[PDB]
Amino acid sequence: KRALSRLKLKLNKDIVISVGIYNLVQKALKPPPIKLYRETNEPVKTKTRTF
Amino acid sequence: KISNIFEDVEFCVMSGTDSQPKPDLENRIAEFGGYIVQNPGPDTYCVIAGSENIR
Amino acid sequence: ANLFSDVQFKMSHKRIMLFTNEDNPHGNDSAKASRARTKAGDLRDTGIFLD
Amino acid sequence: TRFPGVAIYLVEPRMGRSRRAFLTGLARSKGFRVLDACSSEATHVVMEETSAEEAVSWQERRMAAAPPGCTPPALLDISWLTESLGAGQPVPVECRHRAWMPAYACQRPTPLTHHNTGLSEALEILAEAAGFEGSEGRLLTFCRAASVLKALPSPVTTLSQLQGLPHFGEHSSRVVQELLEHGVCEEVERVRRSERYQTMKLFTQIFGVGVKTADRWYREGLRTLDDLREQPQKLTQQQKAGLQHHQDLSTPVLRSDVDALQQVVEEAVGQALPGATVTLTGGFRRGKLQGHDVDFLITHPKEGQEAGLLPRVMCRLQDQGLILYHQHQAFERSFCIFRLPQSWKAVRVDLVVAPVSQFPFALLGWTGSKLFQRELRRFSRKEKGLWLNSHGLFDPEQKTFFQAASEEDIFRHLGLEYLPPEQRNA
DNA sequence: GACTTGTACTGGAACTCACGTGAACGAATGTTTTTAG
DNA sequence: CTAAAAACATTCGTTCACGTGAGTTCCAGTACAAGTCTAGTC
Numbered sequence: 001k002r003a004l005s006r007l008k009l010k011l012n013k014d015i016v017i018s019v020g021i022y023n024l025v026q027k028a029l030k031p032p033p034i035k036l037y038r039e040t041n042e043p044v045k046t047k048t049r050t051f
Numbered sequence: 052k053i054s055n056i057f058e059d060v061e062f063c064v065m066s067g068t069d070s071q072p073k074p075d076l077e078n079r080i081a082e083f084g085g086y087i088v089q090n091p092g093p094d095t096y097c098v099i100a101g102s103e104n105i106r
Numbered sequence: 107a108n109l110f111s112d113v114q115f116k117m118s119h120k121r122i123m124l125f126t127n128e129d130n131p132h133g134n135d136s137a138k139a140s141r142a143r144t145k146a147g148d149l150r151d152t153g154i155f156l157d
Numbered sequence: 158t159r160f161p162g163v164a165i166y167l168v169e170p171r172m173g174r175s176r177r178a179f180l181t182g183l184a185r186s187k188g189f190r191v192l193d194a195c196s197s198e199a200t201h202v203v204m205e206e207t208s209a210e211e212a213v214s215w216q217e218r219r220m221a222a223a224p225p226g227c228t229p230p231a232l233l234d235i236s237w238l239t240e241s242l243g244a245g246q247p248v249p250v251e252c253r254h255r256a257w258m259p260a261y262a263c264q265r266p267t268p269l270t271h272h273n274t275g276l277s278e279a280l281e282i283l284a285e286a287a288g289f290e291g292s293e294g295r296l297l298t299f300c301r302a303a304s305v306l307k308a309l310p311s312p313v314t315t316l317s318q319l320q321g322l323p324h325f326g327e328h329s330s331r332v333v334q335e336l337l338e339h340g341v342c343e344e345v346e347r348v349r350r351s352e353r354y355q356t357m358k359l360f361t362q363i364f365g366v367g368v369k370t371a372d373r374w375y376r377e378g379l380r381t382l383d384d385l386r387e388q389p390q391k392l393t394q395q396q397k398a399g400l401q402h403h404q405d406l407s408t409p410v411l412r413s414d415v416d417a418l419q420q421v422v423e424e425a426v427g428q429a430l431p432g433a434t435v436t437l438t439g440g441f442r443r444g445k446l447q448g449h450d451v452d453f454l455i456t457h458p459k460e461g462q463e464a465g466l467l468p469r470v471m472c473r474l475q476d477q478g479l480i481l482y483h484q485h486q487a488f489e490r491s492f493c494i495f496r497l498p499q500s501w502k503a504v505r506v507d508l509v510v511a512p513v514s515q516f517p518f519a520l521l522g523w524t525g526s527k528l529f530q531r532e533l534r535r536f537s538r539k540e541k542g543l544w545l546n547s548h549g550l551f552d553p554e555q556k557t558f559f560q561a562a563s564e565e566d567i568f569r570h571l572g573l574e575y576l577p578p579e580q581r582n583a
Numbered sequence: 584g585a586c587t588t589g590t591a592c593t594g595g596a597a598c599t600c601a602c603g604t605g606a607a608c609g610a611a612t613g614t615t616t617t618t619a620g
Numbered sequence: 621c622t623a624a625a626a627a628c629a630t631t632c633g634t635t636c637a638c639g640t641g642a643g644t645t646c647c648a649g650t651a652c653a654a655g656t657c658t659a660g661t662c
């Protein structure tokens with residue numbers, strides 16, 4: 001269990017309460033693939049640069 | 052480096068025999084001054100495998 | 107208990123599983139049985155659930 | 158190349174192969190001369206996402222394999238290359254692109270005369286003031302700081318010459334600041350002018366009067382030497398002897414008195430027994446021209462002979478008519494107050510008897526300074542794990558003494574360079 | 584006072600989760616142009 | 621002329637890569653307490 005967000009429900013400009021948002025149903029996704037070095041099968045860092 | 056019979060090679064080994072498993076085969080082929088690749092590639096000369104597993 | 111205490115990550119649960127087919131292991135002896143009861147009580151008071 | 162006077166080289170470790178190729182192609186399209194491999198022709202080198210130090214490490218490793226006389230290329234950052242490419246010509250280079258003092262005193266020699274007399278004196282005064290309050294740790298650390306200052310090869314004039322020196326914390330550093338920047342330090346002068354310091358120093362100079370007794374007298378209302386003589390009933394024999402001859406013992410002892418005392422003592426030692434040897438230890442053995450007492454060590458070449466020499470020599474000297482006070486009026490140590498001809502003067506003399514096997518150990522224990530001896534003992538017990546005292550060196554693990562036939566063996570077996578007595582001045 | 588050892592506290596970074604944005608490939612369908620019968 | 625084969629255009633779903641806010645917790649860093657400081661004789 002983990003609240004998606006602790007948000008502020010405002011019935012007015014002064015009447016305010018705190019609520020928590022949860023996802024009782026969430027799409028199940030396959031684990032994210034990772035990149036490995038073919039020669040020796042180790043993780044490889046991914047870096048993006050703009051020039 | 053007992054002898055030079057492979058020179059440059061990209062040997063791939065997946066499943067060795069019980070008598071000489073992968074740990075005892077990788078260094079054995081490396082002793083001939085070759086290259087070991089855990090997965091096959093375009094340069095790989097051949098892929099060595101014993102028991103026919105899923106891979 | 108020593109194995110449980112060795113780890114450092116916070117434990118939400120501490121469970122022990124006893125796979126055996128000996129209803130009365132310490133039948134001939136009695137002091138060993140009492141030591142077992144005392145150790146089980148200590149573990150239960152510590153917060154370890156044995157099944 | 159259109160720029161014969163400019164040569165550039167790139168670096169693989171951090172720049173990357175793709176960036177290498179892109180930059181090389183762009184520079185070549187812009188006419189710059191880019192070298193595929195490092196060579197003596199290279200004049201400048203570009204390093205990206207790297208610290209200067211590593212760059213130097215990169216250059217030296219490359220320079221070690223180059224012929225002598227080659228001018229090293231200038232180390233620059235990728236910013237220079239980017240600016241040159243943007244402007245189309247080489248942009249001018251600017252600034253952006255472009256064991257020691259061991260803690261233990263047993264390792265650093267301390268000559269008798271140094272170039273930090275004022276600072277050492279101030280630190281010693283602070284140590285004495287701290288000791289007067291019963292805080293032995295403060296006295297020890299201040300003495301260690303003073304010794305560290307004494308061993309400085311060159312005079313200290315700038316604060317920056319205080320970081321690497323050990324045993325130099327906030328208090329000592331602040332005292333050195335006050336001394337160097339202005340002159341007379343506020344704390345040093347304040348403690349010196351304190352009447353408690355003066356009275357305690359005066360009392361301590363009395364033979365047989367220690368810090369505890371001086372403090373007790375302070376709390377009892379005796380603020381000057383006269384009150385001590387007013388009531389000569391609470392003073393023990395040592396204190397009475399010290400006060401009776403206070404003036405004579407206050408004057409420093411000169412080398413002439415040392416030679417006279419040695420000449421007198423040699424005859425007494427011979428009369429007590431022939432073939433005995435006497436060695437002068439203490440401050441005088443270190444080269445000092447002044448002191449408070451003459452320290453002697455008596456030994457015999459044979460092993461079992463050195464049994465009862467000291468009582469015999471003491472009795473012979475007493476028969477001479479020179480002893481004014483004797484520690485005891487079997488023993489192997491005694492400090493007295495000789496009556497040397499002058500009129501006459503009172504000079505403190507210390508005699509010690511040790512066997513030939515333990516002779517080097519006692520000689521080392523008595524020659525070196527108090528602080529030096531303390532530091533050497535601490536180093537022996539902590540680093541090497543051996544117990545060192547005036548009698549011998551002991552190994553707790555192997556219950557066997559590690560005696561030696563020469564004093565230098567003590568330093569040799571402790572993994573320390575040899576020092577002479579003159580350099581053991583704290 | 585300076586150093587060393589041991590214990591306790593704590594804010595930042597690593598990890599995970601979830602969402603949004605943008606780019607690329609292939610499937611399926613529809614539509615247009617060109618060429619052999 | 622004719623239909624049909626090829627080529628072209630569109631929309632959708634899936635995959636992936638990156639960026640970013642929020643919750644949890646693990647640990648390096650900091651702070652603080654306690655011990656040490658030489659060895660012996662008399």
Ligand SMILES: Nc1ncnc2c1ncn2[C@H]1C[C@H](O)[C@@H](COP(=O)(O)NP(=O)(O)OP(=O)(O)O)O1
Binds near residue numbers: 438439440447523524
């Ligand atoms: N607390 C101590 N711990 C270890 N050794 C000590 C010591 N006190 C003295 N010694 C050892 C080392 C000392 O070198 C030796 C001489 O003792 P002194 O005559 O009391 N002091 P010195 O001769 O250095 O100064 P001066 O010439 O003014 O007399 O005894």
Ligand SMILES: [Mg+2]
Binds near residue numbers: 450
């Ligand atoms: Mg002396």
Ligand SMILES: [Mg+2]
Binds near residue numbers: 439450451452507
């Ligand atoms: Mg003396």
